[PDB]
Paper text:
Aureos typically consist of an N-terminal domain with unknown function, a basic region leucine zipper (bZIP) DNA-binding domain, and a C-terminal light-oxygen-voltage (LOV) sensing domain. LOV domains are a subgroup of the Per-Arnt-Sim (PAS) superfamily that sense blue light using a noncovalently bound flavin cofactor. Here, we present crystal structures of a fully light-adapted LOV dimer as well as of a dark state LOV monomer of PtAu1a.
The LOV core forms the chromophore binding pocket and closely resembles the structure of VfAu1 LOV (root-mean-square deviation (r.m.s.d) between 0.42 and 0.58 Å for 101 Cα atoms and molecules A and B PtAu1a and A,B,C,D,E,F for VfAu1a). As observed for VfAu1 LOV, the C-terminal Jα helix partially folds back onto the surface of the β-sheet and interacts with the LOV core via hydrogen bonds between the conserved residue Gln365 and the carbonyl and amine group of Cys316 as well as the side chains of Tyr357 and Gln330. A´α forms an amphipathic three-turn helix and interacts with the LOV core through a highly conserved 4 amino acid linker with Ala248, Glu249, Glu250 and Gln251 in the hinge region. The chromophore binding pocket is mainly formed by hydrophobic residues that stabilize the FMN chromophore together with Gln350, Gln291, Asn319, Asn329, which form hydrogen bonds with the heteroatoms of the isoalloxazine ring. Crystallization of PtAu1aLOV was performed at 20°C. Dark state crystals were grown in sitting-drop geometry with unreconstituted PtAu1aLOV protein (chromophore occupancy ~55%, protein buffer: 20 mM Tris pH 8.0, 100 mM NaCl, 10% (w/v) glycerol) using a protein concentration of 16 mg ml–1 and 40% (v/v) ethylene glycol and 0.1 M sodium acetate pH 4.5 as reservoir solution.
Residue numbers in the entry: 239 to 372
């Protein structure tokens, strides 16, 4: 709740989605998200965030995000995302399930952090090794 306030003042790139609506659409996007991705609000409001994914996005990573959403818990992962002009960037992605006072999930918050090639090489390597383990 103030978590979201904290992201605003930290000027982060994030969206909030509403899983009560079909296909878990975006109901808010920060200015930082618009700047990073090059989309406008009209393009993304009421839409699922998968438009950030492209042909070279690791599907194992997308799957990890899917399970956390199905279970209503938190995770992070580094994957390839795509801007509106089709240019790419490395995204250290974080997602949190927001629960109400009764413990029911009301929202998801996805924070996008653009990261370097150097950083991404290490983390995706570690992710590949984790996947190879299981
Ligand atoms: C709050 C939120 C933020 C999201 N942000 C991203 C993102 O930055 N990058 C990404 O590749 N997927 C993002 N997604 C994941 C997709 O929306 C989708 O949940 C994922 O691709 C798995 O579900 P699907 O198989 O139905 O596409 C986000 C999802 C949520 C709920």
């Amino acid at each position: 709740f103030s978590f979201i306030k904290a992201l605003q003042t930290a000027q982060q790139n994030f969206v909030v989605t509403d899983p009560s609506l079909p296909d878990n659409p975006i109901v808010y996007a920060s200015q930082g998200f618009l700047n990073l991705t090059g989309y406008s609000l009209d393009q993304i409001l009421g839409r699922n965030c998968r438009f950030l994914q492209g042909p070279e996005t690791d599907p194992k990573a997308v799957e990890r995000i899917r399970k956390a959403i199905e279970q209503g818990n938190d995770m992070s992962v580094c994957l390839l995302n795509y801007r509106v002009d089709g240019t790419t960037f490395w995204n250290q992605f974080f997602i949190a399930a927001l629960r109400d006072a009764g413990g029911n999930v009301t929202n998801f918050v996805g924070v996008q952090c653009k990261v370097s090639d150097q950083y991404a090489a290490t983390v995706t390597k570690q992710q590949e090794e984790e996947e190879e383990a299981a």
